[PDB]
Write a protein that binds this ligand. Structure first.
Ligand SMILES: COc1ncc(N2CCOc3ccc(CN(C)C)cc32)cc1NS(C)(=O)=O
Length: 862
């Protein structure tokens, strides 16, 4: 009673939408979703509460492994036991496993405490000090991201021996508190009227209507008659479509576009012809229209919630029978589809093989794919998508024949399944099949594609769907998946077209983890304070000097309400990172229009690794930055899987609200512009501005360390030259390029990509060529190694070209202005030269790299 009511108010506050608002809709689809998903998520919670202690570590602290390890050398490690000040430093091999390190620490504890211990190494796990990260399992130490990170930066790993009883105490502490196919007549509707229409009185109003199965028309579009512009237009007319009622596929959507003609677009509205319970819709429909920015088939099938101001179209769906009509059950479909004809010549089998291994077709090529559909299934199962695209979705007999093959189709690789999630495959059985083949995604692969899977929810026609159930089950089985699923949904609650769907998924998730709900509430409280703090800084920076606004920001942060809200939270950018003590004196803000905040933290428990920063931004939109950075990270994983480490810096970036988000601070780094300012009385001051970068590296890396820094610069420079070229990152200048004290170069500010439109050429800067060449004018040995790194990076990306294409195609659902159409996708197709052979693509890259070298030399002339 009192706990339920409190939890309900806590979910309302967390998701940014009162749960009573779901109840007020009196929507049976909303009610069934809420009841079935609450049950599903509570069942997941009960399974979790009884997990074994090692399984609970897999849930709460999933392993962070090196990409090359997924599916020798000496090392110094500092190990302590929980709640003990005392620690032990000892030598291990990078090939040693956590258990050997643990047995070693237990022998030391037994010698110091003078007693032969009862404890076996099997009863413990290794925590990374002051982090929600653990080392466990039969993996050598160098396979762990944390150990790998220490090895490269020279730092000593600091670990804590945590007993099973302590992990079990965590699990316990975090518990949830106790017949259609006979109807041959053409499809028709009555277009009754319009309400709250706003247009120029000199013009006339028209309603264009179309039937779609995804993006493809099921028949030609039909238009109403022209009627004089007014607030309440009255048509009362029959719109007849060239398709029989029996031929409407299950996922058929009726799409409307209201406009004014002398073309002046006004509004659009879509609806599914069948409901969530498979019933063919009849009766009057009031469609609350969305404003046009003509027909929008990809647009949401739910009405505009702003019923007070929105244009409304009133339609009538006729009663096609005196009894309700449902879409036929799978048994009936399989029965009709089971019947057909299966041959073809040795020459035409070569023609089919040619086009299936080849991707638009000519009409005759389509007919052969369809005729040879059984052979597509048995000998080319990976060509399923091609066959689905040749299926006549406007003929129920062909759809039955297609569904018959699909229902016995072998499971496809993850790559093939991602393509099938596109809106180009709108059928529900196709969608279910795609999810079935995605079930084999590892948590690491799932995390890599989570952003695209969340965007795909915007294409879904109904609330209760296989994709939502899949995402929820995986989120509830892995705390990190759960964390990012929550933030990707929460960051879009200000978007009315997704607020209901996203709000309902977050509620179900919360029912599955009351403890995680409170952990996320703590994060939301810090974000609420940062927004109030940022508003103060925006106002104050216009009235006074920078030192004054900064002192005022500090005084504001030092208030008890701010010190409480801003400290002791898991970072929204990374739940493994603990943001412990806010270091007010180190906090500041940037001089740009939105005055973003620079927030520093420290943790005595984590030591040096506890010194972390976040950038809070309110006013800018970080969605494209997050996507670009996720793509750069993916490049890093694919390169590392080929044994290529280009020493990349894919720092965290996460939208959290309406034009609000965080960016991970990379410490010990500066922009190229700041370094090239060549200030006097500094360790880097230069005789020639071209020496500035190398002198800065020299001051940071004395003696023998310079060699390693130049190499880190070269590797990262090759990675970023390739990444920015492939992704078409433009507006590159000295203040959006950074260098770490390690020598690593990295890019920032990804507000423009995919050419935005101009084809971005490969960029080679003389300043960077100068450092790669160790400061020498001529150094082809070092320069050409760098070219090899670029070529190797580029050829790896090309081999995974389809993965980038499939992911970017799914991202079109995000509604990013620079990722809206096929033209934007064509940019990636050209940058990766996907229509060519590897030798032709490498020849093309070489011409592009040489064109960038001749461009660079115009600066070398001076
Ligand atoms: C899209 O905006 C951003 N993208 C990335 C960063 N990074 C992330 C990595 O750590 C950094 C360390 C220093 C600087 C450069 N300094 C001048 C603040 C920038 C960054 C920062 C911003 N936004 S800002 C700070 O420029 O207002």
């Amino acid at each position: 009673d009192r706990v339920k009511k409190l939890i309900n108010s806590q979910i309302s506050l967390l998701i940014g939408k009162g749960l009573h608002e779901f109840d007020s809709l009196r929507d049976p689809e909303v009610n069934d979703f809420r009841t079935k998903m609450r049950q599903f998520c509570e069942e997941a919670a009960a399974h979790r509460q009884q997990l074994g202690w090692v399984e609970w570590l897999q849930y709460s602290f999933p392993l962070q492994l090196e990409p090359s390890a997924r599916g020798n050398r000496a090392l110094l490690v500092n190990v302590k036991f929980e709640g003990s000040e005392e620690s032990f430093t000892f030598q291990v091999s990078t090939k040693d496993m956590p258990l050997a390190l643990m047995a070693c620490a237990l022998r030391k504890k037994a010698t110091v405490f003078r007693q032969p211990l009862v404890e076996q190494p099997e009863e413990y796990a290794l925590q990374v000090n002051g982090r929600h990260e653990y080392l466990y399992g039969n993996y050598p130490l160098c396979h762990f991201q944390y150990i790998c990170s220490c090895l490269h930066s020279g730092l000593t790993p600091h670990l804590t021996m945590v007993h099973s009883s302590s992990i079990l105490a965590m699990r316990d502490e975090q518990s949830n508190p106790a017949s259609l196919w006979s109807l041959e007549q053409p499809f028709s509707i009555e277009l009754i009227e319009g309400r709250k229409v706003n247009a120029d009185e000199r013009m006339k109003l028209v309603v264009q209507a179309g039937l779609f199965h995804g993006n493809e028309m099921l028949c030609k579009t039909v238009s109403s008659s022209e009627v004089n512009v007014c607030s309440e237009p009255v048509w009362k007319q029959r719109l007849e479509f060239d398709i029989s009622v029996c031929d409407l596929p299950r996922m058929a959507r009726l799409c409307f576009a209201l406009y004014a003609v002398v073309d002046c677009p006004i509004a659009w509205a879509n609806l599914m012809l069948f409901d969530y319970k498979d019933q063919l819709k009849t009766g009057e429909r009031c469609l609350y229209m969305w404003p046009s920015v003509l027909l929008n088939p990809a647009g949401t099938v739910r009405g505009n919630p702003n019923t007070e101001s929105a244009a409304a179209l009133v339609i009538y769906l006729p009663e096609v029978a005196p009894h309700p009509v449902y879409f036929p059950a799978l048994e009936k479909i399989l029965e009709l589809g089971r019947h057909g004809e299966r041959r073809i010549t040795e020459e035409e089998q070569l023609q089919l093989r040619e086009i299936l291994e080849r991707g638009e077709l000519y009409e005759h090529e389509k007919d052969l794919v369809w005729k040879m559909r059984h052979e597509v299934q048995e000998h080319f199962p990976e060509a399923l998508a091609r066959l689905l695209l040749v299926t006549k979705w406007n003929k129920h007999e062909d759809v039955a024949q297609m569904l018959y093959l699909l229902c016995s189709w072998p499971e496809l690789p993850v790559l093939s399944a991602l393509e099938l999630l596109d809106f180009s495959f709108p059928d529900c059985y196709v969608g279910s099949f795609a999810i079935k083949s995605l079930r084999k995604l590892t948590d690491d692969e799932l995390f890599q594609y989570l952003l695209q899977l969340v965007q795909v929810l915007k294409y879904e026609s109904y609330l209760d769907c296989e994709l939502t159930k899949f995402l929820l089950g995986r989120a509830l089985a892995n705390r990190k998946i759960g964390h990012f699923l929550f933030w990707h949904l929460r960051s879009e609650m200000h978007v009315p077209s997704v607020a209901l769907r996203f709000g309902l998924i977050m509620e179900a998730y919360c029912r599955g983890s009351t403890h995680h709900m409170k952990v996320l509430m703590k994060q939301g409280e810090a974000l609420s304070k940062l927004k109030a703090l940022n508003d103060f800084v925006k106002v104050s920076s216009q009235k006074t000097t920078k030192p004054q606004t900064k002192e005022m920001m500090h005084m504001c942060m030092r208030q008890e309400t701010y010190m409480e809200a801003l400290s002791h939270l898991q970072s929204p950018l990374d739940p493994s990172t603990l943001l412990e003590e806010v270091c007010v004196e180190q906090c500041t803000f940037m001089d740009s229009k939105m005055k973003p905040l620079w927030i520093m933290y420290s943790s005595e428990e984590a030591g040096s690794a506890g010194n972390v920063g976040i950038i809070f931004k309110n006013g800018d939109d970080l969605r494209q930055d997050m996507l670009t950075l996720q793509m750069i990270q993916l490049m890093d994983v694919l390169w590392k899987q080929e044994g290529l480490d280009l020493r990349m810096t894919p720092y965290g970036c996460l939208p959290t609200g309406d034009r609000t988000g965080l960016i991970e601070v990379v410490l010990h780094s500066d922009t190229i512009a700041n370094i090239q300012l060549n200030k006097s009385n500094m360790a880097a001051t230069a005789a020639f501005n071209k020496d500035a970068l190398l002198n800065w590296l020299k001051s940071k890396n004395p003696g023998e360390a310079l060699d390693r820094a130049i190499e880190e610069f070269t590797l990262s420079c090759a990675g970023y030259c390739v990444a920015t070229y492939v992704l078409g990152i433009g507006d590159r200048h000295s203040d959006n390029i950074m260098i770490r004290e390690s020598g690593q170069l990295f890019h920032i500010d990804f507000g423009h990509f995919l050419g935005n439109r101009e084809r971005v050429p490969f960029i080679l800067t003389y300043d960077f060529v100068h450092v790669i060449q160790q400061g020498k004018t001529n150094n082809s040995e070092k320069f050409e190694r760098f070219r090899g790194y670029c070529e190797r990076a580029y050829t790896i990306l090309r081999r995974h070209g389809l993965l980038f294409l499939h992911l970017f195609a799914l991202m079109r659902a995000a509604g990013l202005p620079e990722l809206s159409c096929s033209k934007d996708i064509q940019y990636l197709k050209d940058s990766l030269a996907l229509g060519k052979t590897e030798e032709e693509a490498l020849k093309h890259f070489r011409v592009k790299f040489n064109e960038a070298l001749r461009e660079s030399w115009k600066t070398k002339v001076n």
